[model samples]
Target: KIEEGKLVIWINGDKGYNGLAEVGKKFEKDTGIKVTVEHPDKLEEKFPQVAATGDGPDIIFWAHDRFGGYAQSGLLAEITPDKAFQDKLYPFTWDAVRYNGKLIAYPIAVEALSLIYNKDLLPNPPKTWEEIPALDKELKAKGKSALMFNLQEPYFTWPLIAADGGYAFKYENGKYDIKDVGVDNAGAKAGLTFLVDLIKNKHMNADTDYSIAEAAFNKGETAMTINGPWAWSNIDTSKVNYGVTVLPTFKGQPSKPFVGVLSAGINAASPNKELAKEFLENYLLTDEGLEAVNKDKPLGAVALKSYEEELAKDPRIAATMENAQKGEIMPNIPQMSAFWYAVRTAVINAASGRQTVDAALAAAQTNAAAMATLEKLMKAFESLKSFQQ
Candidate 1:
């Protein structure tokens, strides 16, 4: 249905090359808007510079968590008061798109981390982190590893910290107050120690990656893993019975993984702004578009009301969505860029037996606090206000 001429779009490449192409084709067919989809492995590396030079694509599909950085850098567009949409979105989903009071993206898909275990091994997922150690003891006695997770990624660890009542940053007075951001906080320290103990006690392998973890579980060498729904599809389930449930909490608190939404945004500087908006309104938010996205991606759609009925059929999706409600959107602040390197260094130091949990967390806290202070000063200067006054 695309007309003679229209705008081009760029999408990040998927390793399997499965979903995005079909979604793009459906979008073009549903609307009389021509689109050229470009999948680049280096899109993340190239986007900022390209956008800065005003040569970016008119429309881009990306994860909503990046909105904070893009908005802070003035590289993203603000979309508000669009009558054709906005009101139709879920309240929490809408809130995720807002950065510094400006809406920068539309919610498309929602996903969260959950506890996946081999039913033959675990029988039931533990309800709390306290049960994990004992469960690991039992599993170890049977000559199988208890659990595995990606220690190299913050995405995996942050949930555990949150479950232990830790927060990366706290919001107060309508802004993020990082004065208390620290891994050395009691809850965070407890969570980190728990993980380290798991490694030391042989409940988990310190060097397990996704492939190693999945392979181990599939082959029945491991019992459980903390991973997202995509793993459910990739693992060979016929040979091993598996079950999914909400991740265990610490001290009666639920494990809150950061919820992420995949969404679309239009470039503010694009010459085809109107056309892009039209495509978004008619092709992205409509029934057909939602169906296309749901069918292709397999993650639950962002249209909460419509998707809820469909979601109920799958217990895994329902549990993940329920947990997502209790979850926080990962921080979108540009200041958080320092966290990745600092946290990984600390975690590595702790895992390698070079430092105690307390020492490692102290290092992370000191580094994070220094970075937070710098960010506060920069924000004050940009606002033309004096912190001293």
Candidate 2:
């Protein structure tokens, strides 16, 4: 239904390299809309720069969490989902693309973290985080590391915090309220302290990079790692047998991963907004499009109702979908930028013996709250200004 005209799209080079080129060609052929696809290495930098100039691409594909800053800054188009399309998508998938009550994007895929373990090594994965410590101690008695972990990044650490009932911010009254950050909450503190103890006691490697962790697990140097389904294809199944299980609960509550979604977002300033919407409706809303995406990626689908039959045929897909029910959408708030840095600093300080767990977490919470409060105050001030004087 698109008019015969040129459309420019920007996608992350990493994703484009993996199969989007063929998908883009098919889209162009079917719609008769000429597309110029730009795959940039620094998409994180380019996205904001293009938006700031008011000359961004007509369409962009990116992670939902990364779009929070753009949405908060008024740099994205607000998409209203038609009732039919809304009913087609999974509730959790739909939740990921929303920011502050606005539908900022259409989900392309969903991701969640789970305990991926070498089944041959452990025979059975620990049912809870508390059980992992004793299991690690037993493995150490046999002279092996029980798990692989990255103490350097908050992305890996946040899942453990969530297992203990910690949250970065609470959603209330249609906005992210930072007044309830759970970094210093008792459950969060206990979770972090356990992770710190693991690193300090040598149950998990403190210096492992993501690649190293993957390789080590494949080679049988480590028993398990917390990872998402996207890593499934790259794993070497012949050398090691692996199985995925829900991240163990803490005190009767299951671990909540920061679920991420890859999605399509339109530019508010695009000249062909209506035509773009038509294209989206035809391609993203149809059975053919859903099958094409699932066939190519083999990841979980965005629209649950249309793909439910397909998902039921594959046990892995079924498990992934079930797991998504216990997940939380990754925060899309701009304050997350500050939150990440502060958390990393806290982890580093605690790991290096420079600060106690209480001090580190207290500092992180204080810093994040201050930044969030300042941002709110600035917006309030702008709202009170009068241009009619």
Candidate 3:
């Protein structure tokens, strides 16, 4: 029987499977606690269900974006680290994982979105989004396009919103004020127009999606693309000579992409609570453990300050870090769940030519209002005991 001494850890197999599997072996060898690493599909959805029943793995991991939902719902147990532990890591890692003024999870690695281009066609990646039109004209003359990416995805598209000086919510007094919505502002629309005009001028297809964008770049049909590290494996780098760099500027402003941190946290319902906590804080989270866990090349830019040097060993990781230094940390707040879809629909409408810029933004404003109302209704709907009383 798998008893108190034996435990399991679950993680996104897609992220660091082999690295962690090796660490789990070392952990088992040293501690006499047989630790198994499980890779289950839909781990995110499955975790909350299992955690609530006290049958989840001792550890779970995700980017800080998801921490807010779990923390607000009490599915996550806050990680208690001494000030020394907190001070040892990158400042942004700590900021990204906090929820309700508490460290809800142990930060692992920092990830940022940036521009990747086919270097063979363009020796230097463009430094401004405004230059894309001219670049598109030159490429179009040669039966290719200047740029391609998941134009419909909100996370990647948020830089356009910032081009107009927009944000999800104003950080009033260092807290996100929910009522101060800025998604539908003028700067947001102007940013949207930049993309819309691309579609209008036939620079890129409105129908272009993630797979198509990457495939197009790989096939030499597009010179440049906006993407992140995870997409690297899917690409055949040999087909296209490429380079990674910070996003080009837009409207005389740097396109500030969102930075996210991957974090690990305890499962509140796990039976191996004390053992797991002891292992996580003492053994498994150290620089040695993380280095072993991320032994695969491009080891995570993790809790150790020295890990940055390790991460810089790879040209791409070095580029991503260089780009990330100027980016914005996306807030891990509950409101973001609704904020994305509402803004995405507007982006789709404008880019697809189904609505004018003004009309599309009007639609976005409507979506936000309806969504905010529904958020309130959801709270009411969820309060079974209080609503009944």
Candidate 4:
């Protein structure tokens, strides 16, 4: 049972805690509820145990991906918002929060990858990946690279691969086909080859990582990079004239990146579920909460449509929304753990030139298949154990 006049939340990061604290100030004043926002070092790992025992916080703040397991295990409370409230948010946001036909969370912000460019160096963003090579010569003469990104990161490389019809899993009939891997298809091979060609020709550096790429961009050493909205924190501080837009096309085909939703959900076992919903609906999901969050960390795309105009004042947010419309929401299934590990290894091997793309992807497919089977077995065992207990 909840202590009267108190509400606790387990969130991550100083910025997140600070922003919620700002919103909580008003919430506390209005309702006499002392909102305790705690930042656990590893809430993802620690939360499930406490939640299962009915000893966790009233609310949890996290990305939508982790909630699928919680929702299925009956650890999270289903939130039923009104039609008017539901209509105020982007539909894709609801898609992220729902599991097995029940809404489990409220989306706070949305994010997707976009092409960020140095406006002073390029004057105009490239329209396609093919246009990049033409600008490389001019950039090299200026002692700069035309572009740079973490070459081996699947998150960063997805646009390149997806632009040519590549995909990690077969998504159809409103669900993901976990067993049907698509990373080694002909289209994927062609797409990966393009990236390998760029590395081989020295158009971009193979050594660039997330930090190195962002540092080069912030330091004005690179003309362009593919990054998400979070990069703005450093870019704003660096004072570089920058522009953001959708990732440039490949051979006239659009690239579909992964869309991630940051969200909040209530604990099913908490006695304060209704009160937590009140806090989420009237306080956190409102304009003040959204504003405070954006102040702490600029949302790439706001989930609430009412905030669209205010958010669009920053062109980067608008561009992110534009790119997001063309993207697919990241699958939240437990099998994604295997998917990530397998794809990461393959991309690193292929991009580093240690192995051919075909061989790497083939090996990844095998590894993912085996790991996914093991994951299913583990999950079944856990369920049986819980049943016995």
Residue-level lDDT tens digits of model 1 in 1-389: 21225776665675212344455566667765666767777776676777777776776777776767666777778875464456665667766677767778777667788888888877677888877878887777887877877877777877886676677776443366556674678788887888788778766777767676767777667788888877776665546788778788777877768888776776665777777676666665665556665665575535545656565688777777767777776666765777767788888888779898889878887888787677777877966755455
Residue 96's lDDT within candidate 4 is 81
lDDT of each: 0.71, 0.73, 0.74, 0.82
Model 4 lDDT per residue over 1-389, tens place: 43445788877775457888888878889988778888877888788888778776888888888988788767888888899889988877888887767789888888899999998897778888887778898889989878988876888888787787778776564456777887878777888888888888889877778997889997889889899987787898999999899888887888878888888888887787777888888988887788887787666688888887788987888989989877767877787888888888887888787899789888888888888899889988999999999
Question: Which candidate comes out best when scored by TM-score?
Answer: 4
Measured with C-alpha atoms, the lDDT of residue 92 in candidate 4 is 77
Measured with C-alpha atoms, the lDDT of residue 143 in candidate 3 is: 83
| Reference-based TM-score of each model | 0.83, 0.84, 0.88, 0.90
Query: Candidate 2, residues 223-335: lDDT per residue as tens digits?
Result: 88877777877765545788777777777787767778887788776776765676566664456665655665565635556766666576556555555667767788767
Error at 230, model 1, angstroms: 3.3
- lDDT for model 2, please: 0.73
- Best-to-worst order by TM-score is 4, 3, 2, 1
Index of the highest-lDDT prediction:
4
For candidate 3, list the clashing residue pairs, or say none: 164-187
In the predicted model 1, the residue pairs found to clash are: none
RMSD of each: 5.4, 4.4, 3.1, 2.8
lDDT tens per residue, model 3, 11-45: 78776767776777777777778777788999888
